[PDB]
Design a protein around this ligand. Structure first.
Ligand SMILES: [Cl-]
Ligand SMILES: [Cl-]
Lengths: 301, 301
């Protein structure tokens, strides 16, 4: 684990691959860290310089006294990119990582060599757009998801659940993984969050989710980023699980077909944290895709 | 499925959208489209996959022909014509690769890309069959040479391949690291119920281009290799440890010497890499096709 000084604090990151290969930036979301990519990085490192940062307040990153809003993560990630001297990269992202990737691509399209993504954030006009699905057998699950996230966004209740009980780490995370993680696999997800204070960024994130116009700044930024994504022509790779969570199989198919140059990769049984159930498949998919793109569109005295 | 071809028929497997790029999967000795069964569904989301059974193999017809390499060329060409395929990616192993190289040599605009593994090349000497510099491998290499010399000897090959069914019962499982379930192994046996039915299995090792003989095939495959060396379409070479016809060291050097040839190093594996690495191969190929397709070409007086 390496450490980059960023805005008076620091961001931890993992790095692998040759310095002269294309950069791939791996972006985690809530409540994870670069730890979620641990079994994916070794499969991509043969073809790319892989960099996987821990978002500020997550993993082994610093814990500065900020609110940890989406726009805070934006600023810290931009400072990290500059600190590392990265001038362009492929982006691989899940959860809030996708929002960061979409917003980066909206501001700096020339930066983006390609975007591989899954279980992404989009503006959600109604609560039925959170965990959207029309499949009858999924309706109870979708309602339960909506109910818990409504509670996370409720004053008092969110604090009790996420800060006191650590429910995002202890319940939501395993709840989005089909297999049961080994204890040694689970431990590094827990270690960043020993106290209610330390859990502040974890509570911040669901309160940033763009639902029914609020918070308006995130909602509008993600509308703008999704419009940019829709018009974009850079290579895109969307992964889909069955049933998934934020992205249903039906929606993934429709969303991918509606973009330009977006392939859809089918992972099979999966929920929100697809990396933990499909590390090998995701890693090999991304490595092949980069090899393909670079084939066609790429020391002496 | 089944296509009438040259007065006989060839069976084939097919999946994927009719308007997607075509991918042709080419098996060799003594297999069939069966060997691709766990790979096809992984590529189907990005491509129209077609996997034929070579004449005299799998569920294809069993005409009274010699089943020389040039016979297989003729029937594969006629299959491609009958299916109305005008260009394709190729995915190949064993004799499938020789067919692929020869196809690409004669029709340089047909091939969209070539993914290959455990391929056939002109072998100036017997030491180039199962070539390896690794000391721990010498005894295995010599044992492969010894048995293939016998297959190629008139009289001897007949007893081993036709009567004892050695290529199906021994060589095939001998090139797979894991042990196939009875249900996986059965479709490999069913094409070959009798000594007469095994004629094509005996013909193939007698076609191997070794020490300049048979010289007609040797010359065709030399020309195919020269065309491959100069080719500019994207390529993807898979290797196993230690492999059989392709050593890790040979593969790495060969891939670097070509134009646009990516290498993927799969891990423990012998000749029939598909059976030990189906998921890795399918995911890699699907991603690689998606990548190449993603970067295809997008005011006046
Ligand atoms: Cl969240
Ligand atoms: Cl053979």
């Amino acid at each position: 684990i390496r450490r980059a000084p960023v805005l008076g604090s620091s961001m931890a990151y993992r790095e692998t691959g040759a310095q002269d290969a294309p950069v791939v930036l791996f972006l985690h979301g809530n409540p994870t860290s670069s730890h979620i990519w641990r079994n994916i990085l070794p499969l991509v490192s043969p073809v790319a310089h892989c960099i996987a940062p821990d978002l500020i307040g997550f993993g082994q990153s610093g814990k500065p006294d900020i609110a940890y809003r989406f726009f805070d993560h934006v600023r810290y990630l931009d400072a990290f990119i500059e600190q590392r001297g990265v001038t362009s990269a492929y982006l691989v992202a899940q959860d809030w990582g996708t929002a960061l990737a979409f917003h980066l691509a909206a501001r700096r399209p020339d930066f983006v060599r390609g975007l591989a993504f899954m279980e992404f954030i989009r503006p959600m006009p109604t609560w039925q757009d959170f965990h959207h699905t029309e499949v009858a057998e999924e309706q109870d699950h979708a309602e339960a998801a909506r109910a818990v996230f409504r509670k996370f966004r409720t004053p008092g209740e969110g604090e009790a659940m996420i800060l006191e009980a650590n429910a995002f780490v202890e319940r939501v995370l395993p709840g989005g993984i089909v297999r049961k993680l080994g204890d040694e696999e689970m431990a590094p997800y827990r270690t960043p969050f020993p106290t209610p204070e330390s859990r502040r960024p974890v509570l911040a994130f669901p309160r940033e989710l763009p639902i029914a116009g609020e918070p308006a700044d995130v909602y509008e930024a993600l509308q703008s980023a999704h419009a940019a994504l829709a018009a974009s022509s850079y290579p895109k790779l969307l992964f889909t699980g069955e049933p998934g969570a934020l992205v249903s199989p039906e929606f993934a198919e429709r969303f991918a077909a509606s973009l330009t140059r977006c392939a859809l990769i089918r992972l099979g049984a999966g929920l929100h944290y697809l990396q933990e159930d499909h590390a090998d498949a995701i890693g090999r998919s991304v490595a092949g895709w980069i090899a393909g793109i670079e084939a066609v569109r790429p020391h002496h005295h």
